Design a protein around this ligand. Structure first.
Ligand SMILES: NC1=NC(=O)C2=N[C@H]3C(S)=C(S)[C@@H](COP(=O)(O)OP(=O)(O)OC[C@H]4O[C@@H](n5cnc6c(=O)[nH]c(N)nc65)[C@H](O)[C@@H]4O)O[C@H]3NC2=N1
Ligand SMILES: NC1=NC(=O)C2=N[C@H]3C(S)=C(S)[C@@H](COP(=O)(O)OP(=O)(O)OC[C@H]4O[C@@H](n5cnc6c(=O)[nH]c(N)nc65)[C@H](O)[C@@H]4O)O[C@H]3NC2=N1
Ligand SMILES: [Mo+6]
Length: 790
């Protein structure tokens, strides 16, 4: 049939080939010099056994609805129903919950979904429900849950998703680059809008500068990252810090900087507040313990003199701090993010090209010069009319909670917690809807999630693959992939390089529907179809989005062609006039005219506002707090001696494309997710490559396939997140996961009272070669379909 069909995804733009109605090969877009291997999984993603073929309802839920046996969730026994029957039940449940409980019982949830301006699954969900009634909202996300709360308070920006100093300037000016828990090479494969991958050009240049010894790269990381491996182990200075001891390391660098007069007094005095209130802590005047190189050597396992050497090197020349997000996705994650800023402040290079800090470097091609282009605005969740049932009665519970507290809300309703200076009362949720997110991938401590779901009346999942979420649902609705629809997207993110047409590759498979059509038909049930669609279909909406784009471009001085011209004749437009950027430079150059958005206008090393909250676990300046569990001598490490990283996958985006055999064949071990193990740790357990091992703690147990790797320091392991949950006894708490989802082993706790964010990477485990029976993996084969024989 058809060859060279242009479209896009989180993993990049493709030229798709179709043969006899099947998507068979995905070639890289011709402008993409650095495509991701993951595009090879996209045909499988469209055509594999886990694709949701039709609406499905959990046997006993179909029988008894909200009066059903919730214990059977997870058993994977579902009945096919018609679309109209499914949508009716959906509507009737919305009606029932609104009448019985009101808006405090209802939660929606969304996530990374797919690229595409119109086919915005989160927007479809939010709009449809918002046209029916009120619900519990959430604040924050799992990416930068801690950082995005603390950083506004201390540097007046969210920071984490923002543009970074242009790489050309970094490469011409920085002499030391500090990668602090950041894997650029691995994580720039997938971006929010279709990636252009042009940032990899800069990484190649960096590689050459490293080889020539012009730039020294320091990696502060328990593991040799993909980036480190790429730049070269012979060249990269590796600080293999003990997991979760980064704050001690930060404080000791700060101490050294002060102790040896390497700090910038002028910068601290003129661009910051509160340094004087922090120093007594740092120096041990108010506790007897200097937060010094000697002190930190005990915690971090880094030689004190190496700590001092690091500080001195950072101060000695132009130094770029590149901070990732993983180190704030753990207990008290705000502390580490805050100390990145403090350390950068003490160095005094903030606002210089290739100096200072940033958190956005691994995301959205950050550091690529931004072009003078157009950014389209997609289908919004926003409504202009009130809900049909506009009940404001949340019965004395809060109407917004932190995103990661939703299970705590189900299990501990009425619990009162602090959140970033406010008081929150967790509502008794009864009905959850998921569209474009996978909770059994995303959230922590799956056995507790199981217990939480068992208190729910109704669970609805809408997806294009039969995920672990779908396995634990009551109603499952088949959404399409983006490859079965038409759309528009940005090409490039921070670069704003271009815009691409997403042309339909194949027709909707089976009776899968675009989320637009799902929620449109739902809205018809309560007479709000028109308010949802705004009188437009797919191609109408795409034309509307483009035209708004055309209007934005005129008056910004960028000319776009007409829609039909673009769609049918061009398919791709590219922008020009790339701009250099230096982050924080405006503030550095004129702090009076360009103040930070902080209480003082300055960098808050001490925050009176935070101090006044009276949170013992997030005080007025950064502090070392001991963790609920930590490796290398921390709590629990006598029982569970290994730190388990749940790092972002190299061969998927989260749980997406786990079902691809094309990709799995490249990294699976014994048919399972690989677990990475240090050679000394492996030899102590008699473990070797290919072994089926049990990774366990007091929270859960999983099976995985051992990879013995010297990239891992002793006492550090990894199972990449996104490995699907596959319980041996479906639905039972304490089931052994046969594929190896790390969130079976994580703990579900708030970072601190400030952010109340996910602490996913605060995880201790043991590993042993497994002595039980290895059953077949059942993760990727859909449900057990059930039929009425009567
Ligand atoms: N390929 C790919 N897959 C994805 O799933 C993906 N997801 C995207 C999203 S949504 C996000 S949030 C980002 C992920 O952003 P994030 O920064 O979380 O990335 P990771 O690669 O998981 O972790 C970065 C590094 O932290 C290190 N690290 C772990 N624990 C510690 C510790 O205690 N101390 C120190 N110093 N380092 C530590 C890890 O070893 C790793 O090299 O990537 C984005 N890009 C993505 N690309
Ligand atoms: N242990 C642990 N460590 C971690 O580092 C960690 N990181 C966290 C982070 S940073 C993030 S971003 C979250 C990610 O959590 P998130 O839930 O966002 O992850 P995905 O696996 O991308 O799930 C998206 C789902 O939407 C579906 N989908 C895609 N397109 C569509 C569409 O058009 N319509 C519909 N209806 N569905 C669609 C996909 O099939 C997929 O199942 O995981 C978090 N969880 C984490 N846990
Ligand atoms: Mo994220």
């Amino acid at each position: 049939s058809k060859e060279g069909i242009l479209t896009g995804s989180h993993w990049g733009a493709i030229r798709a080939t179709v043969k006899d109605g099947r998507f068979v090969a995905a070639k890289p877009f011709e402008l993409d010099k650095y495509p991701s291997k993951m595009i090879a999984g996209l045909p499988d993603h469209v055509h594999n056994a886990a694709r949701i073929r039709y609406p499905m309802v959990r046997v006993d839920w179909l029988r008894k609805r909200h009066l059903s046996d919730t214990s059977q969730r997870g058993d994977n026994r579902f009945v096919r129903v018609s679309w109209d029957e499914a949508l009716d039940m959906f509507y009737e449940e919305l009606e029932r919950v609104q009448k019985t409980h009101g808006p405090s019982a209802l939660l929606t949830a969304s996530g990374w979904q797919s690229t595409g301006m119109f086919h915005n699954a989160s927007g479809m969900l939010a709009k449809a429900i918002a046209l029916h009634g009120n619900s519990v909202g959430t604040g924050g996300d799992y990416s930068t849950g801690a950082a995005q709360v603390i950083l506004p308070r201390v540097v007046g920006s969210m920071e984490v998703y923002e543009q970074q100093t242009s790489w050309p300037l970094v490469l011409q000016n920085s002499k030391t680059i500090v990668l602090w828990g950041s894997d650029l090479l691995k994580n720039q494969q997938a971006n929010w809008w279709c990636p252009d991958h042009d940032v990899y050009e800069y990484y190649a240049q960096l590689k050459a500068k490293v080889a020539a010894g012009e730039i020294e790269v320091i990696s502060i990381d328990p593991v040799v990252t993909s980036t480190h491996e790429y730049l070269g182990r012979e060249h990269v200075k590796h600080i293999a810090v003990n997991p979760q001891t980064d704050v001690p390391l930060q404080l000791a660098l700060a101490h050294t900087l002060y102790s040896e007069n390497l700090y910038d007094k002028n910068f601290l005095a003129n661009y910051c507040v509160g340094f004087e209130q922090f120093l007594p802590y740092l120096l041990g005047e108010k506790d007897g313990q200097p937060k010094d190189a000697a002190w930190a050597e005990k915690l971090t396992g880094i030689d004190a003199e190496t700590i001092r050497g690091l500080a001195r090197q950072m101060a000695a020349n132009r130094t770029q701090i590149i901070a990732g997000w993983c180190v704030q996705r753990m207990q008290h994650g705000e502390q580490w993010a805050w100390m990145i800023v403090v350390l950068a402040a003490m160095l005094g290079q903030i606002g210089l090209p290739g100096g200072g800090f940033g958190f956005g470097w691994h995301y959205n091609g950050a550091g690529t010069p931004g072009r003078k282009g157009v950014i389209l605005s997609g289908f919004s969740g926003s409504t202009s009319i009130p809900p049909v049932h506009d009940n404001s009665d949340y019965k004395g519970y809060s109407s917004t909670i932190p995103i990661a507290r939703f299970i705590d809300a189900i299990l501990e309703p009425g619990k009162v917690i602090n959140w970033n200076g406010k008081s929150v009362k967790l509502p008794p949720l009864k009905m959850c809807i998921f569209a474009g997110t996978n909770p059994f991938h995303r959230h922590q401590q799956i056995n507790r999630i199981i217990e939480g779901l068992r208190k729910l009346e109704t669970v609805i999942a809408i997806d294009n693959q039969w995920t672990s979420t779908c396995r634990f649902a009551d109603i499952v609705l088949p959404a399409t992939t983006q490859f079965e629809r038409n759309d528009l997207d940005q090409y490039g993110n921070h670069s704003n390089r271009g815009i691409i047409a997403m042309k339909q590759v194949v027709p909707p498979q089976f009776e899968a529907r675009n989320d637009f059509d799902i929620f449109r038909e739902l809205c018809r049930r309560f007479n709000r179809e028109e308010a949802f669609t705004e009188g437009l279909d797919e191609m109408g909406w795409l034309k509307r989005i483009w035209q708004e784009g055309v209007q934005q471009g005129k008056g910004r001085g960028v000319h776009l062609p007409a829609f039909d011209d673009f769609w049918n004749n061009k398919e791709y437009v590219e922008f020009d006039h790339p701009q250099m950027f230096v982050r924080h430079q405006a503030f550095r150059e004129d702090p009076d005219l360009e103040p930070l958005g902080t209480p003082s206008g300055l960098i808050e090393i001490y925050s009176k506002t935070i101090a006044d909250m009276n949170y013992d676990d997030c005080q007025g300046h950064p502090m070392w707090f001991e963790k609920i569990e930590r490796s290398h001598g921390g709590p629990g490490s006598q029982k569970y001696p290994l730190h388990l990283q749940s790092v972002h996958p190299d061969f998927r985006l989260h749980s997406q494309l786990c079902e691809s055999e094309t990709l799995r064949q490249q990294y699976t071990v014994a048919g399972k997710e690989p677990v990475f193990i240090n050679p000394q740790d492996a030899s102590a357990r008699g473990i070797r490559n290919g072994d089926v091992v049990r990774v366990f703690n007091a929270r859960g147990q999983v099976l995985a396939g051992a990879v013995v790797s010297d990239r891992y320091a002793p006492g550090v392991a990894r199972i990449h997140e996104g490995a699907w949950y596959d319980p041996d006894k479906g639905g039972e708490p304490g089931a052994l996961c046969k594929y190896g989802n790390p969130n079976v082993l994580t703990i579900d706790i708030g970072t601190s009272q400030l952010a109340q964010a996910t602490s996913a990477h605060t995880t201790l485990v043991e590993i042993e070669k497994y002595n039980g029976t290895v059953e077949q993996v059942t993760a990727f084969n859909g449900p057990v379909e059930m039929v009425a024989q009567c």
